[PDB]
């Protein structure tokens, strides 16, 4: 009876297990845009990819992640709010059964039909592991989707998936350039807060996005037809796999712009 996002181990129940759920940081929010304060002291955001390293993708069970080689100083993220270098080792998205739902951060309450979230994790921690013991362990950059425009350098990802149906399947993927997926703008909100699902460690500095991508309806309908089961057992679509709104509590949003 493990976790997941079914009629009856989803995100109301993880507190059982994982009783940080209830803490002071919790991930994700709705982001007011009114009462997100401009910071003229942050920052742009420094995305630096261009020596990223992708090799595989996975069907974890709840998503798929694309997971970059990250024993090198190769695909960092820095800047914006961050002090210091932090280091891309996967991706992975959040949709909805429907057009209408999927993100896990909502903006005046707006739902996104999914949201990409780019995995970093601070290098003075020396790998992944350590880094999610601190409270300024990871920076999380999450990109929402809107459905319109097919996104070109989305559909090597929406090909694979055919492959990695189930769950425990994975399928080499090298060469995925994640420049692909940014949008124009990289203005953003931050706030401090946690991993969206268990063990909702807090220990990530958030940067969204306000320019959502555009991905077209048929590649969020291949995304919707991963299955959350493994080969041999009876079909669940992999769709709402997102954590709603948590109480902001004692945080401010800021804002890199306007
Ligand atoms: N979505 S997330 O921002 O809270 C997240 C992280 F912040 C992570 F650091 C990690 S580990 C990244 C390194 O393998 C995640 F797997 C996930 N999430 C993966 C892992 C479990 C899961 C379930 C549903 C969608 C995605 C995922």
């Known amino acids: 009876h493990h976790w ?4 009856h181990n989803g995100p109301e129940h993880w507190h059982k297990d994982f009783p940080i759920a209830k803490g002071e940081r919790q991930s994700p929010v709705d982001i007011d845009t009114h009462t997100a304060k401009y910071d003229p002291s942050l920052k742009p955001l420094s995305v630096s990819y261009d020596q990223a390293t992708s090799l595989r993708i996975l069907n974890n069970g709840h998503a ?3 997971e970059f080689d990250d024993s090198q100083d ?3 993220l820095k800047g914006g709010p961050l002090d210091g270098t932090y280091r891309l080792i996967q991706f992975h998205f959040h949709w909805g059964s429907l057009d209408g739902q999927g993100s896990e951060h909502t903006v005046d309450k707006k739902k996104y039909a999914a949201e990409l979230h780019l995995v970093h994790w601070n290098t003075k921690y020396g790998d992944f592991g350590k880094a ?3 409270p300024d362990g990871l920076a999380v950059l999450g990109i929402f989707l809107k459905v319109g425009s097919a996104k070109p350098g989305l559909q090597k990802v929406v090909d694979v998936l055919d492959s990695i149906k189930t769950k425990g399947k994975s399928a080499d993927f090298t060469n995925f350039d ?5 949008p124009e703008s990289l203005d953003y909100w931050t706030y401090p807060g946690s991993l969206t699902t268990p063990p909702l460690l807090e220990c990530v500095t958030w940067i969204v996005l306000k320019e959502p991508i555009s991905v077209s309806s048929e590649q969020v309908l291949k995304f919707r037809k991963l299955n959350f089961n493994g080969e041999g057992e009876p079909e669940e679509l992999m769709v709402d796999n997102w954590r709603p709104a948590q109480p902001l509590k004692n945080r401010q949003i800021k804002a890199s712009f306007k």
């Open 64 to 66: 798929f992640n694309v």
């Open 178 to 182: 994640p420049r692909g997926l940014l």
């Open 74 to 76: 190769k695909a960092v």
């Open 4 to 7: 997941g996002y079914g009629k």
């Open 132 to 134: 999610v013991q601190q």
